[PDB]
Symmetry: D2
């Protein structure tokens, strides 16, 4: 019932920088499924695909929120077409989160990380995964906030086990 949104790099699953993140992505997906959480993501490839595969492997449900004319990775329990472009799709995606977990990522993920914060959604950065997940950590205010209104705390975990632990810890 608790909903967690996962964001990260897009692009081919079999090539860098998402290929080096396979085990972490699959572990994250399976663990969320095992814990009974409903998983949401941007529905494309990359990290999104791998986490989905992991959730389905464990029999969990994963819902994809898709931009305009996209099909969705083959592991989606439900593929939701929006008709919206990438960025706006992301904001409707964020609305479905109780918590957001970030992995690597380029500009799209950065917008989602910042958006999750503006909407008061707790964010858990899975450190060591590169991209903006690690980059955004270098500009935190008081090591926990993305702006001076300290809307919600940005959390940091170096391990999937540490991540879920934080989700449970609210």
């Amino acid at each position: 019932m608790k909903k967690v949104v996962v964001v990260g790099y897009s692009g081919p699953v079999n090539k860098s920088p998402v290929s080096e993140l396979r085990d972490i992505c699959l572990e994250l997906g399976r663990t969320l499924a095992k814990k009974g959480y409903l998983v949401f993501n941007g529905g494309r490839d990359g990290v999104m695909e791998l986490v989905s595969q992991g959730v389905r492997e464990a029999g969990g449900t994963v819902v994809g929120i898709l931009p305009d004319e996209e099909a969705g990775n083959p592991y989606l329990s439900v593929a939701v077409k929006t008709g919206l472009d990438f960025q706006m799709r992301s904001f409707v995606l964020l609305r479905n989160a109780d918590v957001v977990v970030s992995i690597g990522g380029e500009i799209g993920t950065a917008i989602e990380i910042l958006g999750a914060y503006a909407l008061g959604k707790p964010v858990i950065l899975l450190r060591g995964t590169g991209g903006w997940t690690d980059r955004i950590s270098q500009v935190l205010i008081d090591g926990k906030y993305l702006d001076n209104r300290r809307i919600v705390e940005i959390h940091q975990a170096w391990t999937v086990e540490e991540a879920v632990q934080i989700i449970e810890q609210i």
Copy 2:
């Protein structure tokens, strides 16, 4: 694999004009589930609630597309928040349909029936259910269209069995 979107009256399920449409709404929901169709709707009460109940009763899956960050009826297999208002939520809803079935409805259903057509989605009106479902049938061009560009045909069915039959006939 096939996605059917159902639209209709909102409002309390236990009062008119939606109460009179209980059996048809439950029949519709169960039959869609039994046939293996994935059901989508506006997620609120009224016809939306009863069709969902019917889908869940038969073990089918029903997904709700919600306006803003609402809650949606208790029978949704998956509730999707959008942060969008009623009318725009309706257009991300229509993007998820292979076919739209209409039951009664007020202005919101009308906008959806019209919206469906503009997006080239076949619409099946379930006649005798009142509201705009019956009202829109009195202005069809050549009895099948909503505008001179004849984008897609507006089908009519006086029975749930007659409705699904039309879907199958595609």
Copy 3:
């Protein structure tokens, strides 16, 4: 500084069915402008263009709200891009109206007429112009409403002078 939104036929501005409305459109435009009203429209062609042209010819201002990335007729004082499809662009357009004036139109216009009503915006149908403007008048509840919640009245005018008169009367 009353904001009036005008909606109607899109398409070649020199051919049927919009060429015949050439005068009522240009005239509504100039009149709206001479009365000091600020005008908004879907910024494309058809009725939308002539009313734009009529507003500039009389030296007023006409703001167009564009679907996604289209150009907008050459008379727009300001061309606002949205990144939204045709139907959603229409709803941001409607938010800018104190009153909506309808001329001819196909499905896009029908959706706008119905949407204006759902948002609570008084609509003035300029009768005899055809399209959905005349078609929608045949299904009015009590001859003034579009649904049983009687959100706001739908006014009818057979003349530009009659139309503005209604706008002044509020």
Copy 4:
């Protein structure tokens, strides 16, 4: 003809951190007007209000894109309502830019700066103005980019005169 979008802090114009930025905001607005650029902004208070005052003071035109059915600051040449929340309103705001100039700002401005980049819109950070405009400069890839696809360059200027100079330099 050339459209520049300016983003920055919101909040009361008479208090920190926006009051300290009065002169720069007014100079930016006046200079844009004098050079003949069409100015767009989020339409609220704060930096948006001051830049607008500056544009109107010099007789230029400034258009506001408002979240929801907001009112807008009293210097807007045209106020455009959208019925969209803050973030999405920002994305339709960004579609109206040939270039984006940033001043101070909290999370909203950060999302706009990142969004601008994802859309291929050159951004000019007006340094020394604090907030995210300065903070985002500490995480540039190769001193110019916001992600490894290097979509478009993020320029930096320490003076209004320097800023407009960069815009002219295309």
